Amino acid sequence: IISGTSVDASDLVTGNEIGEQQLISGDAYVGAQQTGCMPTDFSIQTPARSAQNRITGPGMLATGLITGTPEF
Amino acid sequence: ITGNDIAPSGRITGPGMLATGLITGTPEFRHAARKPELVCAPRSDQMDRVSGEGKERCHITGDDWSVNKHITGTAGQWASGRNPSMRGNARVVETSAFANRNVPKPEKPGSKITGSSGNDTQGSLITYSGGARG
Amino acid sequence: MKIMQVEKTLVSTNRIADMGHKPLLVVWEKPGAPRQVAVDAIGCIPGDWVLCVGSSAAREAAGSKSYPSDLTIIGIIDQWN
Amino acid sequence: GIALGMIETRGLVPAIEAADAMTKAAEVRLVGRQFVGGGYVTVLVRGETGAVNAAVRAGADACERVGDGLVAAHIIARVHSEVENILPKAPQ
Amino acid sequence: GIALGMIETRGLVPAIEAADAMTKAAEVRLVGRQFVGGGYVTVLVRGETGAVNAAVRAGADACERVGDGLVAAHIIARVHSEVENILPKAPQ
Amino acid sequence: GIALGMIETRGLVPAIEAADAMTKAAEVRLVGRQFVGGGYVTVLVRGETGAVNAAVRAGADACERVGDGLVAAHIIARVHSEVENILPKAPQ
Amino acid sequence: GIALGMIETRGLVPAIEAADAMTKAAEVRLVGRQFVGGGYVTVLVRGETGAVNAAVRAGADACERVGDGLVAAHIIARVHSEVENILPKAPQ
Amino acid sequence: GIALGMIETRGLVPAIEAADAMTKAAEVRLVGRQFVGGGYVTVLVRGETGAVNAAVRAGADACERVGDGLVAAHIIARVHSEVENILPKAPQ
Amino acid sequence: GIALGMIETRGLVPAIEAADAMTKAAEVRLVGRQFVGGGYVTVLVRGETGAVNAAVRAGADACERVGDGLVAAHIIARVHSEVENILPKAPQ
Amino acid sequence: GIALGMIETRGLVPAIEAADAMTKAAEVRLVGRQFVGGGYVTVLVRGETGAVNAAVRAGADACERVGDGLVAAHIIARVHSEVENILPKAPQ
Amino acid sequence: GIALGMIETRGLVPAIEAADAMTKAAEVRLVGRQFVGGGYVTVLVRGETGAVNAAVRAGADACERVGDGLVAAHIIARVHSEVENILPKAPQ
Amino acid sequence: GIALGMIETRGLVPAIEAADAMTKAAEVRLVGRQFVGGGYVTVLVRGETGAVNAAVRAGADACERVGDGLVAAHIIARVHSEVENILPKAPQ
Amino acid sequence: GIALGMIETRGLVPAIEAADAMTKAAEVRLVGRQFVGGGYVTVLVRGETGAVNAAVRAGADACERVGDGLVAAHIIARVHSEVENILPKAPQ
Amino acid sequence: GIALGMIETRGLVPAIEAADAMTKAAEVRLVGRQFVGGGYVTVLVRGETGAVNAAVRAGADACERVGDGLVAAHIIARVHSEVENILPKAPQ
Amino acid sequence: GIALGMIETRGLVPAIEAADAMTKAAEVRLVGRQFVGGGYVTVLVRGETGAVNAAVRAGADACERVGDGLVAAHIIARVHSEVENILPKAPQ
Amino acid sequence: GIALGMIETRGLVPAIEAADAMTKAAEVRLVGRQFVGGGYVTVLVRGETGAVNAAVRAGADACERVGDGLVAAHIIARVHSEVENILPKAPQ
Amino acid sequence: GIALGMIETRGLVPAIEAADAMTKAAEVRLVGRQFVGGGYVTVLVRGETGAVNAAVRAGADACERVGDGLVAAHIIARVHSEVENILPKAPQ
Amino acid sequence: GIALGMIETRGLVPAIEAADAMTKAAEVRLVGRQFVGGGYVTVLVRGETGAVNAAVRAGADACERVGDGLVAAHIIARVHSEVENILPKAPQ
């Protein structure tokens, strides 16, 4: 209970009400009466992270059409 | 393939009808690609007709003086039938040292002699005058 | 045992069959001493001072308790004279 | 102005709106806009404590539904004299 | 014109689409392109409030289905003078 | 020509496949390769309109299955002069 | 003052909060803050093993629920001379 | 030779392994290493088409289990002269 | 020495732990710490083959549960001479 | 290189598609186009064995569906000196 | 322009109609006509990619009911410098 | 040689395969390749009877499955003196 | 050439078949034939990587059913410069 | 590097694979290859001890499944002066 | 001295281990290495009897589990003047 | 600092590992090593209280499974002035 | 050399064997033999990390069957400068 | 002589028996007697290699059943120079 001059939201007072009930972190300069009181992974998704954090080329084309000297 | 066929045949005997299945690199192979323990018989299990250089226990391969049953002549009936012969019935006892090896013999002389005489009873039968063990 | 120098080899073709295929070496206590013969159980070159064992021991040093040997070379002396 | 106020956002568009709502809501001084990497943008204000609290509640409400959104809204009323080395002094 | 319009997109191909759409749709001024990080690109236009509103509405539809898409479409009719330090004066 | 083809991809290996395909398919010039961030690479070509349509349909098919993939393949037949400031004139 | 405390966080806001808590909680000097890419920021302190074991505990408490959070809270009680080249110097 | 074989990996350890595996496996010369961003590293070799085919097979297998792994393996038997500008000539 | 050891990690805090364990265990040399992007930080050490095997084993064990952890521990007793032009000589 | 690549087609339009594809795909020289008769056109490409393999596969994949189509795609890595007297050295 | 347009037809009548409908339709030059054999005649037109694409569609529709019919209608947007030898560069 | 081998094939590619196989399979001389018409190409070799048999059998196997394939494979161990006038003396 | 090909066989007759099949198959040089001991004969060929690949496959298929058979068929696309000292340059 | 590594093998193909893997794995110099007889071949390498350990562990792994395989893989870190006379000593 | 130690082994790796052990374990001189055939290698040493006994014992133990192993280990205290001529005077 | 840390082990090898693991771990001075008899060896360290707590835990883990192992690992934060006489000041 | 290799034995005969085996197996220095008491004797050697690895392995094998045996075999590849006080500089 | 025999015992009475028997067996010099600790006593003799071998074998037989028994009997014909530092020169 923090007695004294109050900088908290009131019904009578206006102009101090943008984000008054928002949970801001850090120093608590407003009462928990309005604001109230475990993050585990980055919340921004990336193209690379979206896909887990075979050989392509001209050898891949015409799989069964070509005949001739085989290689292995 | 058509025309002049020089491929191996069973109607044309000759040198290309041999080593069938042992030869590789032939047109046919290239298309498809797309005993005794001892040379000399056991010494105990054989007895040679003619010993010495006539022995036939060892298998000599090659051109070797041996003659198939196909080939006739020289030995066999060509040496055996020329002269008539009658084998008579007279197989009789051999009088010899070797045939007398197991002759019945009289009881062995013994010695009741005492004193130092070299009286060995275990060696060959030495005998003295009258068949007395010596 | 005796310290005897090898002088030469000895060869008896008519040796008893009980001697087996075993080398025999003429030996002597010094050059000029009486020449004995020993079964060479070790391999000894001529001029080698050698250790020679007498009867009973020499029969088993020569290969069997029933070996006909009263003298056998049981070793070569690392250094003598 | 020794209080620090900081809004982190998923993108620059919420961060610019936050910088606009923060600097128009109270007598704060916008000192830094950092690309933290990964699509994290941090707008930092420096003013008296009440000014900063008013500014950061206004910034957070302004950029909550702009773009990807608000990651953090955080006030530090007195910063240690050592944390002031890692704090930018003029927005670039 | 002082108004700001800003289109954030996932990638540069949607951002180039949005910048063309915006510059063509109205009398706005392409004032900068920013690579935020994490594959977010912010295109910023400055023009009158009527111009920027017309431009950003067009840019939002243009780049909504180009590449990864639109993150944010936002309009700030007047930016605080503090915020203009963190805004690009000319494109680079 | 002044038409603009742009292929974004998730990596530089799908982007080089796309650049080769695009710049062999039609008479287009490779004007740039940009690393956006987050693993996004954009290969931008400039040619006449039909040339660029052909090049960007050749690039997309090529890189669709090279590496992590193709994000965008976009033609802009005319680009505002404003957008030309945010576009690469040469690939170095 | 040879021990190192290190807090990695997901963003600059959790990191500045940890830096403040660490420097206030014990006798540790803030030597540097590193942007690591992908949204990781690392706040390094240097002090005695007790000063530091007390700072890194205080810091992880501060930034655990701030923003995207804490990734790592590590203490190295003696730092090899070689590892000091890869470590920010104290003017940072 | 003027062929181009290129391996993209998630991180530097897998890519240094790919480059080493490739330059040990065939007659190729390492011409570049690129940090694409967001943890994509592309290693590139220029050689004869037989050598590059042999090099990229051995390189792809080597780096497949090293770290976060292989994203792309890709041979371009002939690169257009235009892609040479966006292609590194010697490793920096 | 010419053996190279490389411990990639998810963040700078797991890589400063890995670098400390590597440098203390054997007579290796931090030849560079790299930010690859995405959060990946690679610690590269160069020493004799016996030293590098001991160091990387110590480093991999130390940073396994530190922060986001170990991605790769990898030793190359001798890199090709062309793989040495993409290797750092000194830490930055 | 001495490897021969050959694409017979049913028409000259599939053959020209094949010659183009082969030449663009790999480092091969177009040595001739022959009108065999009956609407069969052969395209012969002489290069190195890997190059010719890449060229023939690209050509076949290209001319397979154009026109009447592909009759044959063949590689002969070494041709006998006799088969040379029936091969065109340069195209007309 | 360097794009090629090709129309193959069964007979000469269907290719003089396609050659005529091509060159009239768009800005293309008839570079030649070839008697492939087997009753196939190929008419080839070199222009820009946009023009050649109009010409080939025109020629194709013009000859599809003339005579025996159409065999192939193929557009190449850039021709390699080596196919140039197998193509008729004719005042004809 | 006096023997004659002949392989007719549907196209030139099966025929070049036949000639190569035939001329490598035994000591035969390619004396002709003949475009008969209708898409039939005939390759003729003159050698000893045994070589021609080995050669024609090899050529039949090689071209059977290449292109449109083999029409005939025939050996004439001795051509009449008059058939020699209708037979090629060296290849074209 | 740089690539090494090797066919080991049990006996000379299988090896001569592999040497012939390999050298006929592609443009490789027979650099050595070595009697290893114990009836093992190695045939070694140096050419381009593509030719050596095609050759060694031809040899292994030819000699497998010839005589005692094949022990090994290996391709080393680029031997280390040190292994060159233990490799033959010309057959004896 | 006065250490010695040796790898005996059944046949020469396994041994050249061992020499290559050994000289590609670590800083070891190939001194000699020997034909023991009975099909045995011994490749010998010389380098710092750890280097020789890595080289011979990598050679054994590579040569173990090629040919008839590995017979022995050994390291003698200090060879006696006498053994140097029976050792090849011939990188040159 | 004139004593002989012989260690026959299967292969040369066990023989070189046998000869290192013998030479390091007593004052004996390696006089020869013989390849007998069938993969038998004899390493022969010469010195006073006690030295040879120690050496042969060390060598046998050393070369026993190396490769194909020890075939024989034998000491001859005094060697006949005739056996001298079948014995290598110096190693080769 | 005046804190005492005291690892005791069965043998000196475990003790040198403990001493080295205690000295590398924290800012502590090895003040002595005692042979107490019966196999026991006690390494003693002196430094601030947290330095000693981190060293005596690093030492115990290091030597726990080395030799016959650890008997005692104990920390005393301040020792009576009478216990300083039975404590060595510098190692011998 | 700054790596330490310590073998512990029960008795002195195993320790002298280890000293001899270690000193003859690698270019290491016997730095001391310590009578720990309870019949534990530690032999300490010092050389490069590879020489010390080889030496300790040799010593362990050698002393495992001499007397009561081996209690420990340990390597410290880098030793703290504090431990150099409790380590014997020269055998005495 | 420079060969080292040494016999260890569980006590001094077996040791004196060994020393006496060794000195009496062959011309060796009793160079030292050590109380290792734990009741291990070692007697050490130096002589010619054959003499030491004869001495140690006789000493071990003498003390095997004397007292608590024998621990080790070891002969070292060539002792390393480094081990001669930890060997006594005259008994005390």
Numbering used by the authors:
A (entry chain X): 615 to 651, 685 to 700, 712 to 730
B (entry chain Y): 702 to 735, 770 to 869
C (entry chain P): 1 to 81
D (entry chain L), E (entry chain M), F (entry chain J), G (entry chain N), H (entry chain O), I (entry chain K), ...: 6 to 97
Quote the study's own text:
The cryo-EM structures of T = 9, T = 9 Q = 12, T = 13, T = 16, and T = 19 shell assemblies were determined at 2.3-, 2.99-, 2.93-, 2.75-, and 3.04-Å resolution, respectively. In the T = 16 shell, the identified CsoS2-C regions encompass almost identical F1 to F5 fragments as those of the T = 19 shell. Intriguingly, the smaller T = 9 shells involved only one conformation of CsoS2-C, whereas the second conformation of CsoS2 appeared in the larger T = 13, T = 16, and T = 19 shells. To visualize the existence of CsoS1A/B heterohexamers and prevent symmetry-caused biases in the process of differentiating CsoS1A and CsoS1B in the shells, we also analyzed the structures without introducing additional symmetries. Fortunately, the density maps for the T = 9 (C1) and T = 16 (C1) shells were retained at good resolution. For the T = 16 (C1) shell map, additional densities consistent with the CsoS1B C-terminal helix were observed at the central and terminal regions of the CsoS1 hexamer. Although building the structural model was challenging at this density, this result confirms that CsoS1A and CsoS1B can form heterohexamers during shell assembly. Collectively, these results imply that there is a correlation between the size/structure of the shell and the incorporation of CsoS1A/B heterohexamers and that CsoS1B is probably highly abundant in the larger shells.
